[PDB]
Write a protein that binds this ligand. Sequence first.
Ligand SMILES: [Mg+2]
Length: 255
Amino acid sequence: SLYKGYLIDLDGTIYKGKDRIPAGETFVHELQKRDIPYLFVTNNTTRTPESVKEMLAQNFNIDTPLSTVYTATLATIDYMNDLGLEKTVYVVGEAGLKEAIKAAGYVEDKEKPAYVVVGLDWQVDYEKFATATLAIQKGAHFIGTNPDLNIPTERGLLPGAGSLITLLEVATRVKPVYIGKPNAIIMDKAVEHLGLEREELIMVGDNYLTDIRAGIDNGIPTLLVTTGFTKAEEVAGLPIAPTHVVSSLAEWDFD
Ligand SMILES: [Mg+2]
């Protein structure tokens, strides 16, 4: 076990949509049995950290602490607090995202906010986009929670946060600061959470462009499970290959 810590993706890796992935569950159990420090890191902001925990326990037999569920939302609020601009903001996204933003020191300002935070909003519409545009044009710090252009639902690959964010980008001509995988911002705060050296850490995911590249671009060993986005047929043909590749997490052990 050259790896002391584990950064784990959720959708497509530990489970698939509303479906189970028994192996992924067993994998988490081993990590728990074996006393190994792990951290779940997801880009999805439409579900709060505590809501994840709930889902995991009631749907995928995983009983995990709250501190082990790192969402792109946490990394975004951390970032905002780090930058320290005045605490005014305009948000496009789901209630959870907004609830936390204001739960921190940020009050909503529709005209001249210091920050404009954009995440996936299942009910985004024109008015919200126009409000966001004007705010960003007037100089607000444009933040995109996660780059994902698509989000898999039990309905297909619908528009993800990235697409909504891109619309505001080409409408304000202002490039946003992406928080989620595979950006350094969330990964730094994640490596910091486990407080372990990237050398002895490994990121596990099903998506090359987000999970895998999250390690490559940030110097962190990677494990790719072709149970989700990146299909096995394409494992050979990727830019920088993943440290380890596997068709199922049941092919991983001690050393
Ligand atoms: Mg995924």
